[PDB]
């Protein structure tokens, strides 16, 4: 499942990209496993959950770069994905 394989992959190199643009290590970890443009919504959601959860004008900048993360890793961005959960 998407939530089963999201634990195996170490997304920490991808979380390191915050403020770097505001390397290939993130895409190297992103390929595994069975991420044929699937479960990328869970992976992208996990990055938002780990760093700067919820909505500061800098998480918004981080949101734009996260959406472009699949493009630089030779992947298509998720079609159905909700990065922000207000919870109220």
């Amino acid at each position, epitope marked *: 499942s998407c939530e089963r394989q999201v634990d195996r992959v170490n997304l920490k190199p991808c979380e390191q990209h915050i403020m770097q643009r505001i390397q290939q290590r993130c895409c190297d970890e992103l390929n595994e496993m069975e991420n*044929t443009q*699937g479960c990328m919504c869970e992976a992208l959601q996990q990055i938002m959950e780990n760093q700067c959860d919820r909505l500061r004008q800098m998480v918004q900048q981080f949101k734009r770069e996260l959406m472009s993360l699949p493009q630089q890793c030779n992947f*298509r*961005a998720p*079609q*159905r994905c*909700d*990065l922000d959960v207000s919870g109220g």
Partner: antibody
Amino acid sequence: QVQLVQSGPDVRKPGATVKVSCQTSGYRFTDYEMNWVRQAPGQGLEWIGLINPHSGDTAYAQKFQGRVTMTSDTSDSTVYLELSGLTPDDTAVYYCARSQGTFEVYYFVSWGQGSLVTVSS
Amino acid sequence: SYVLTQPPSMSVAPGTTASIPCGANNIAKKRVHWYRQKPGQAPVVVVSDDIPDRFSGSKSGDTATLTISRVEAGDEGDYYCQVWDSKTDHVVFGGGTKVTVLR
């Protein structure tokens, strides 16, 4: 030129199963998810379900769960809708819509011609 | 069970501005798209959430309104508002709004 071509009108007996096809061309298949929308002869649009040709994942509406099955064939770039247990209320024109969007944005840009399936004995 | 409520019908004088409401709970947080369906034809999207046209969308507060500037004879038809719910992974369509141009 994104083209969506559907099957012709079908007449099925009540309680039977109907299969509606949606041929796609002009765009890269398995790159955009596709949805099925049905419209009663005098009523409004009703969303049935969702299919992702790249992954095979199917997202159905709560009402249609257990009665609808969606299949995709990347060899001919087609999306199929299969409704089981046909009731007289199911007679409607069935549309297939191509979805263009990323993350929160999700909308249909290339609707199909529609298939008027009539459930009657 | 995300419900989108739309007026059943609307009559607009020619040359004036039209406003079709679409009311759901906190619809501003969601993305609202409007489709226009001529009778006997597949619906056609008039406004979407990412050249100017007479059709535009505001999406402020609990209700989202579609505005048609300078209503003409060709603007008649049924207009539908649709959003993608996240809490249930469902695509929901609003009720049919039959727009009639006064003559």
